[PDB]
Design a protein around this nucleic acid. Sequence first.
DNA 1: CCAGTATTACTTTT
DNA 2: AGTAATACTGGTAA
Length: 362
Amino acid sequence: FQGSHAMQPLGMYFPASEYTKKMKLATRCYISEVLKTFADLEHPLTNVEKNYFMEHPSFKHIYHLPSGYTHKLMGMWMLFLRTASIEKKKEVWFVVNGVPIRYGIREHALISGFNCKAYPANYQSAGNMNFANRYFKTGVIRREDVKTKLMEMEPARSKDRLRMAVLYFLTSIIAVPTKTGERASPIDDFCVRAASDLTFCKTFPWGRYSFEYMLKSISHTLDHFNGVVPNTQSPWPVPGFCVPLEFLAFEAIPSLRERFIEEKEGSHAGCPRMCKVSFKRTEMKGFTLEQINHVLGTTEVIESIIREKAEEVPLLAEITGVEDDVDKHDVVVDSWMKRLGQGREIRFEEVYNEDVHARMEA
DNA sequence: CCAGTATTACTTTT
DNA sequence: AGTAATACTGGTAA
Ligand SMILES: [Zn+2]
């Protein structure tokens, strides 16, 4: 008995005829802008203002990222094309060369290092609207409005700028509007109220928040394409902190890691994964989907759940709950978890030959 | 030319 | 409020 049996997915969002279809994808995660805005303030940030972000239990890892961070998304898109239809709602799975790969809060935490513990009690009530009423008249608050105030505010004993800085940070990196311009969508109301309490903001599980936000963009994306990738130059926006999604395929799949990833010199070993690796420079601003598909090749070495190294065990003990949470009943995902739980790997070989045929031959 | 990014215009919902 | 079209960036390769 070589293990409990793992069932094929009920369905897939995309047929394998779409695996070669390239798309432009629009991020909404302005890591580079925020840092430039912060560094170019006419009245600079004080030590306490600076160290608030550079020693933040979650956001200090934003500073371990490479300078001028630019997102690379065809790994994420390759994953998206392989999203399985499942019952669970708090985790996503992608079937690559017939191997299911999980994107859950544990994986969002191992790559980003953000706090992914349970929300504090009655966390929505946190804050008040007093801080924002002191700077923003009645109406919509757009992201450009928060940035503008920050660059103009005068530094002073009230740490109100830091609150504006934090609000700018949250709504530009964690929970980010899609629409821009004169009619940009209003920024997340929770972040507006949460930014009034700097203590609360230093400890909140912003990873869970970022993660739950990513889950909505994933669902919206899959809803939008309805199984067909069009032929358009018009980019599709996927807002939120997508760095974990950008790296998942590379952490899971050694063939991609060997061609497109390099270790980051002098990184600390207790940091999450995004601090300790970097994308290789390529011919383009990001990898082409063809490059990903070609390097996938015929590889069978793929991790379903990406295993932590020993140096990463204290990290996860600190940023993840031991509270595996409650989700909808999933006979298929349960049968995967049961087989992986016993040390056995999963591989639907018809799906593997389909993937190989759709990329390498057709 | 390209993928990532920023911006403006047109469509759908309400 | 949502999506599509357009244009800009900083490269590479022809
Ligand atoms: Zn780090």
